[PDB]
Write a protein that binds this ligand. Structure first.
Ligand code: HEM
Ligand SMILES: O[C@H](c1cccc2cncn12)C1CCCCC1
Length: 375
C-alpha cells in the first residue's frame, strides 16, 4: 500500500477526494465573487467587488480541504482580476485585501500564489449525487471563468483521466515489492495490470470532444489560465501588495504540473527530466507548482531501484513485453493528446502553438524511445 503521507487516494489518485464545496460563513464575500466570475467580469463589476473586500484572516480555514477550497476561490478571483474581460486591459497589482490572505494560504500549503492544475482540476469538482459513481453526468466543477468557456468539460475530462489512472497508481507498491522479493511472475502480472489500466484511460480522453469546443477553449479558457512568467503583458510579474515589495513571476496553470503521467515516467525510467533541454527544465520547474505530498511521491519513486534496469538485466522476453506494454500505453495517451492539441489549439491559432507542439512532441518522443522492442 502507498503511504498515507503521499496524499494519493485509492479511488481518485492524485485528485482531492470529495473536495469541500462551501467555506465557513466568514468567507461569504470571497465565495460570492468566485461563484459569479462570468457575470461580474462581463458587467465590468469584478475589479470593484474585489477592491471593496476587507482583508479576511485565513485562521478560520482549519483543515486541508477548506484550505484547498480557499486556494481555488482566491486563485480563480486572481485570474479574473488580472485578466479582466480577457482582451488586454490587465491589472499589474493584486490588492492587499486578497493578495495577503492568498499568499499566506499558499505559503501554508507550499504552493505558489497562482492557480495551478491541483486547484483548477484536482480540487475543482463534486459529485452531483454522492450515491452514484464517478461519471461525467454525475459530476460538476465548482468554478468557471466565463459563460461558454468549456471549463466544466476541460477540467472534468482531465479529472476523469486522473481517476482512470488511480487503478494503475495503486499497483506501484506491488511492482517495487516484487523486485525487492525477486518475484518475476508477480512483477510481470503487475506490469500488465498497469498497462491494462493506462489503456482504459485512453477511452476517457475521447469524452473531450463532447464537452469542449475549440473556439471557446482557445479564445477564452486559455486566456484565463495564463500566468505572468515570460509574459509580455506582465513583463515583471504581479505585485502581491502587502506581501512582497517587488513583482513576482509565476507560470500559469498547466498539466505539466500534473503527477498522473509523470509518476509512470518515473516508475518506467523514462527520463523526461534528464538533461538541460527545454522540456526537461519545464517539467522539473512545474514540480514546484505541484502539491508537496505529490512532489515527494515522485522524488521518492526516483530514490527507489530502477524498474527498467531490472527488466533489462534479466534476458526475459515476457517481462520486457509487459514493461513495453506500459510504455506503449503512455505513447498512445500522448499521441491521442497531440491530436487533441491540433484540434483545440493549432487549428484555431491558424484562423487568427509551435512551442507547445514541440514540448509535447519531445515528451512523446522520449516515451517512444524508451520502448525495449517496438521500433
Ligand atoms: C482540450 C483538451 C486539451 C488540450 C488542448 C490540451 C493541451 C495541452 C498543452 C498545450 C499542454 C502542454 C503544457 C502547457 O502548454 O501548459 C498539455 C500538457 C499535458 N496535458 Fe493536456 N490538453 C488537453 C487535455 C488533456 C487531458 C484531458 C489530460 C488528462 C489528464 C491532459 C493531460 C496532460 C499532461 C499529462 C500534460 C503534460 C505533458 C505530458 O505528460 O505529455 N491533457 N496539454
Ligand atoms: O497545460 C494546461 C492545462 C491545464 C489544466 C488541465 C490541462 C490538461 N491539459 C493541459 N492542461 C493549459 C490549459 C490552457 C491551454 C494550454 C494548456
Amino acid at each position: 500500500t502507498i503511504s498515507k503521507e503521499y496524499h494519493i487516494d485509492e479511488e481518485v489518485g492524485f485528485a482531492l477526494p470529495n473536495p469541500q464545496e462551501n467555506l465557513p460563513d466568514f468567507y461569504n464575500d470571497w465565495m460570492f465573487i468566485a461563484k459569479h466570475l462570468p457575470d461580474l467580469i462581463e458587467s465590468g463589476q469584478l475589479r470593484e467587488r474585489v477592491e471593496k473586500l476587507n482583508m479576511l484572516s485565513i485562521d478560520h480555514l482549519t483543515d486541508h480541504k477548506s484550505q484547498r477550497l480557499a486556494r481555488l476561490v482566491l486563485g480563480c478571483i486572481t485570474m479574473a482580476y488580472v485578466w479582466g474581460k480577457g482582451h488586454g486591459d490587465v491589472r499589474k497589482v493584486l490588492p492587499r485585501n486578497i493578495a495577503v490572505p492568498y499568499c499566506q494560504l499558499s505559503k501554508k500549503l507550499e504552493l505558489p500564489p497562482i492557480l495551478v492544475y491541483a486547484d483548477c482540476v484536482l480540487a475543482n469538482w463534486k459529485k452531483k449525487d454522492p450515491n452514484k459513481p464517478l461519471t461525467y453526468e454525475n459530476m460538476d466543477v465548482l468554478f468557471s471563468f466565463r459563460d461558454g468557456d468549456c471549463s466544466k468539460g476541460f477540467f472534468l475530462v482531465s479529472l476523469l483521466v486522473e481517476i482512470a489512472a488511480a487503478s494503475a497508481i495503486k499497483v506501484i507498491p506491488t511492482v517495487f515489492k516484487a523486485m525487492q522479493m525477486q518475484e518475476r511472475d508477480t512483477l510481470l502480472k503487475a506490469l500488465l495490470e498497469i498497462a491494462s489500466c493506462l489503456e482504459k484511460a485512453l477511452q476517457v480522453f475521447h469524452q473531450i470532444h463532447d464537452h469542449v469546443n475549440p473556439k471557446a477553449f482557445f479564445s477564452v479558457l486559455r486566456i484565463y489560465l495564463s500566468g505572468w512568467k515570460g509574459n509580455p503583458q506582465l513583463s515583471d510579474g504581479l505585485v502581491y501588495e502587502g506581501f512582497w515589495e517587488d513583482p513576482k513571476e509565476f507560470a500559469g496553470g498547466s498539466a505539466g504540473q500534473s503527477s498522473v503521467f509523470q509518476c509512470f515516467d518515473v516508475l518506467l525510467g523514462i527520463q523526461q527530466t534528464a538533461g538541460g533541454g527545454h522540456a526537461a527544465q519545464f517539467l522539473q520547474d512545474m514540480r514546484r507548482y505541484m502539491p508537496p505530498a505529490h512532489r515527494n511521491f515522485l522524488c521518492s519513486l526516483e530514490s527507489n531501484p530502477s524498474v527498467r534496469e531490472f527488466v533489462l538485466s534479466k534476458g526475459d522476453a515476457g517481462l520486457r513485453e509487459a514493461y513495453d506494454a506500459c510504455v506503449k500505453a503512455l505513447v498512445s495517451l500522448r499521441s491521442y493528446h497531440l491530436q487533441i492539441v491540433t484540434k483545440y489549439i493549432l487549428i484555431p491559432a491558424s484562423q487568427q502553438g509551435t512551442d507547445l507542439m514541440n514540448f509535447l512532441k519531445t515528451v512523446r518522443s522520449t516515451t517512444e524511445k524508451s520502448l525495449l522492442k517496438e521500433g
